[PDB]
Amino acid sequence: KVYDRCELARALKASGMDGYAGNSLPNWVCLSKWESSYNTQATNRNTDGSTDYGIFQINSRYWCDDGRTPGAKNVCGIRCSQLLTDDLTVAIRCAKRVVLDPNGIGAWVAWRLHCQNQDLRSYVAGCGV
Ligand SMILES: CC(=O)N[C@H]1[C@@H](Oc2ccc3c(C)cc(=O)oc3c2)O[C@H](CO)[C@@H](O[C@@H]2O[C@H](CO)[C@@H](O[C@@H]3O[C@H](CO)[C@@H](O)[C@H](O)[C@H]3NC(C)=O)[C@H](O)[C@H]2NC(C)=O)[C@@H]1O
């Protein structure tokens, strides 16, 4: 499913993502926008054999099992396939686990590049959240 910006915002707010580990809502909308363009079925293969999965583009080397990534750890304890569903429950739960590591929201290259040290007010504007 390709989420509408405000449709996503409402779904993340409802899942407790606003302030999750000190990361306000606009941070998560900004990273979903630039990581996948709000598409839960987005996939991206890397040089090293790993693949990025879903709306938050979670890597198969540490967080999920896709059966073709060499030396993977599956810390989220899921199949990567579970990150591409229209239903965000599993993606949210894994993303929640990703920001608990020391690097936090800095784990996401799109966040560091287009959201970090920017005015993200516009990503939630008009959503009524
Ligand atoms: C949001 C997702 O999937 N992001 C992960 C991933 O994602 C991408 C995704 C797309 C790209 C693209 C398109 C291009 C490009 O150049 O790079 C990418 C990296 O690749 C990073 C590789 O460094 C991971 O970051 C690395 O990931 C784990 C998660 O924490 C680390 O292991 C953990 O390291 C910390 C030390 O800080 C410990 O606390 C824990 O022991 C440990 N493992 C566990 C299980 O928690 C490691 O350090 C950290 N790497 C560095 C060098 O930043 C980050 O998680």
The domains of the chain are located at: 1-129
Cα–chain-centroid distance for residue 60? 13
Which residue minimizes the CA distance to atom 21 of ligand 1? 107
Domain 1-129, CATH 1.10.530.10 — does that match?
yes
- Report residue 71 as tokens: 């030396």
Transcribe 30-79 into DSSP letters: HHHHHHHTTBTT-EEE-TTS-EEETTTTEETTTTEE-S--TT---SS-EE
Residue with tokens 């990503």: 123
User: Residue 126 Cα, ligand 1 centroid: separation in angstroms?
Assistant: 33
Contact residues of ligand 1, CB 6 A cut-off: 44, 46, 52, 57-59, 62-63, 73, 75, 98, 101-103, 107-109
Helix, strand or coil, per DSSP, at residue 20: strand
Spell out the residues 6+ positions from residue 16 whose beta carbon is closer than 8 angstroms to its own.
Answer: none
Is 66 designated active site? Answer: no
- Name the residue of 46, 55, 101, 108 whose CB sits within 8 Å of the most ligand 1 atoms, as the mutation to test its pocket: 101
- Name the residue of 31, 35, 55, 62 whose CB sits within 8 Å of the most ligand 1 atoms, as the mutation to test its pocket: 62
User: Residue 38 Cα, ligand 1 centroid: separation in angstroms?
Assistant: 22
**H or E segment and range at residue 18:** none
Q: How far apart are CA 69 and CA 62, in angstroms?
A: 10
One-letter identity of residue 26:
P
Residue with tokens 């979903």: 32
Q: How far apart are CA 17 and CA 97, in angstroms?
A: 12
